[PDB]
């Protein structure tokens, strides 16, 4: 059971990620001229974090 719990912990250790960014946006629906403010989040140390079209 100790060996199985160690294998469980090592299987859990691979999915523990670092450095993942995340985008967010209210109002997924939008009109022709409505703003729909996009907000991004980068967990990098220093970056430029632009938006590309």
């Amino acid at each position: 059971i100790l060996n199985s719990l160690s294998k469980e912990l090592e299987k859990l250790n691979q999915q523990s990620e670092v450095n993942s960014i995340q985008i967010f946006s209210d109002k997924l629906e939008v009109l022709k001229d409505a703003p729909a403010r996009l907000w991004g989040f980068s967990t990098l140390s220093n970056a430029k974090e632009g938006f590309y079209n």
Binding site: K27, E29, V30, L31, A34
Partner: protein
């Protein structure tokens, strides 16, 4: 308010209150007031659905 949900609710309230039984100004006014109340309810719907998720 959210704009497109307001437009769809305004259209649906103008379909429910059919315009043959309604003067046009009072029809548009009652549909607008009911759509604004529907937006005020849908805010709490968004909060409750986030909590339930």
């Amino acid at each position: 308010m959210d704009t497109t949900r307001f437009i769809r609710n305004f259209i649906l309230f103008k379909d429910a209150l059919q315009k043959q039984n309604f003067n046009n100004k009072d029809l548009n006014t009652t549909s607008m007031q009911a759509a604004l109340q529907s937006e005020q309810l849908a805010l709490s719907e968004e909060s409750q659905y986030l909590q339930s998720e």
